[PDB]
Design a protein around this ligand. Structure first.
Ligand SMILES: *Cc1c(COP(=O)(O)O)cnc(C)c1O
Ligand SMILES: *Cc1c(COP(=O)(O)O)cnc(C)c1O
Ligand SMILES: [Mg+2]
Ligand SMILES: [Mg+2]
Lengths: 307, 305
């Protein structure tokens, strides 16, 4: 009934961010249509500013006053949050373990971040981030559980429902479930007859196990997967939305993820990152054949291109 | 302009908890009137179920599965009683290195104990693990809005029991009690002053209000007032910042002398943390409070000693 956002938050996020992000195109592939027996549509967030959808949630958090923003998610969220900060005239501090390789340190510096070091543990990441937040009088922006962020990711669905007016399902890769939850909130509020499907690595299948057992079941161990963007577990804010509003979750093997990513590179000529191959792998997977033949028009979110 | 609770939440908490708490009496002391030059009224939460006001917030949180906390003193004791009223287990997270006497005391008030290591880190994560495994909820001792709303009900009773009250004086630790009370008084009768009382040895609240920003204690405070070692937090600070009129600090010696004064001259078995409000009104700087602030109600917040 009442989740950490409603669709009103998504609409507000849309107005909030639309002048500063790309309304990314929806593309097709007859080769992938033939392989799946479906009518596929590819929402190209790999074309989004900062190279992934995450600028949606990050910009909405910064515009929704703080003197600085902080995160220890140093990948696509960190990159997105730093750009959002730049747009708003404030520094972004990224908390990074001191033991991170130079190449990662340099890449984080290169996207505009001010780096603060921690020790390589979840414990240290959070407390150093808290200290930086409290010293800079800024705010921490979580990559997937922050309601302002979830609301921002949900705007993807607003665009898809307009761009593919006869869409039957969306397929969404799931890590922390920020994108999945924002989309589920939006689709089910506007057109609940459209299916919302998550796509998840078998090697990181906390979301799949959670919906099966009916309770939040985070990955016990740090996941090993080439889909680097979906290693996070779902959390306290995204799980209830995913529990009630997401229709199914499809897991894919490491090999499925690799083959799908290569298929997209080679036959679609789109430079997606492997995390973005996860949704494509799902629609190609054996179990997706159990999806009713009436679910013909399927939009897959190609969520990033930072590779 | 909009905090983590409103007056409406306080009133709902009062209705929610009234059948299971005591409307504690307000007492007086001509000796302490004489020493202060004020007309004092003592709200006796030392007489409250579980021995402190904390049952107000604890019960409201449980009525608003299992409950979990790593605050093992008056809050854990209150939370365990609330849990038992509601037919659910209460899990108190305690460091392994805690003294046997303290482990036995926590067991004796009805808790199921789970061990952690003696760090804030370990306390929180073990508490979190117990919470997920029992499908329960963690109830924070001072930052949980349902708890804050519960403590606020003290002010409802005081305003009713002392119609001509000019000020309330409240010990502050995490500021749950202070913030709840400030929300209530300033909603109902903002002409009444809300004063906090704090140990000089744990003066984060005082320093915060001075600097205009949340300034937690840098180190674990050393003070005989065990119940107010916690710093104020993200939910209670904004209320305290905007709705509390003044914070008075007191020395360790002032706290000790006030506590013995209450024992010897009032014959009330307060715990030393409850002596802090009394020390505040006796302190030198309280003499700067306008003479028109005559009727002062001090909360004697606990008797678990
Ligand atoms: C973050 C990320 C995801 C997963 O998003 P969540 O909201 O964490 O589920 C998917 N694809 C890419 C490219 C990402 O960076
Ligand atoms: C907890 C406690 C306090 C302080 O209450 P807070 O809400 O943490 O400020 C004061 N007196 C006693 C006896 C207490 O147990
Ligand atoms: Mg997962
Ligand atoms: Mg203090």
């Amino acid at each position: 009934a009442q989740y950490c956002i409603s669709f009103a938050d998504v609409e507000k996020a849309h107005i909030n961010i639309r002048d500063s992000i790309h309304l990314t195109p929806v593309l097709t592939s007859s080769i992938l249509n033939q392989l799946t027996g479906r009518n596929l549509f590819f929402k190209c967030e790999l074309f989004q500013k900062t190279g992934s959808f995450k600028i949606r949630g990050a910009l909405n958090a910064v515009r929704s006053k703080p003197k600085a923003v902080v995160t220890h998610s140093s990948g696509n969220h960190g990159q997105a949050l730093t750009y959002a900060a730049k747009l708003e005239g404030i520094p972004a501090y990224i908390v990074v373990p001191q033991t991170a390789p130079d190449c990662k340190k340099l890449a984080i510096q290169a996207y505009g971040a001010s780096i603060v070091y921690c020790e390589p543990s979840d414990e240290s990441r959070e407390n150093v981030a808290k200290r930086v937040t409290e010293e800079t009088e800024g705010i921490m922006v979580h990559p997937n559980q922050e309601p302002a962020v979830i609301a921002g990711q949900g705007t993807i669905a607003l665009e898809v429902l307009n761009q593919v007016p006869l869409v039957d399902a969306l397929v969404v890769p799931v890590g922390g479930g920020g994108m999945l939850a924002g989309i589920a909130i939006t689709v089910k509020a506007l057109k609940p007859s459209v299916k919302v499907y998550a796509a998840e690595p078998s090697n990181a299948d906390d979301c799949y196990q959670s919906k099966l057992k009916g309770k939040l079941m985070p990955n016990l161990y740090p996941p090993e997967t080439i889909a680097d963007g979906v290693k996070s577990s779902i959390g306290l804010n995204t799980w209830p939305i995913i529990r009630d509003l997401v229709d199914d979750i499809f897991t894919v093997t490491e090999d499925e993820i690799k083959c799908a990513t290569q298929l997209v590179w080679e036959r679609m000529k789109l430079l997606i990152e492997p995390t973005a191959g996860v949704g494509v792998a799902a629609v190609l997977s054996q179990h997706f054949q159990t999806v009713s033949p009436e679910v013909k028009n399927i939009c897959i979110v190609l969520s990033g291109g930072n590779v």
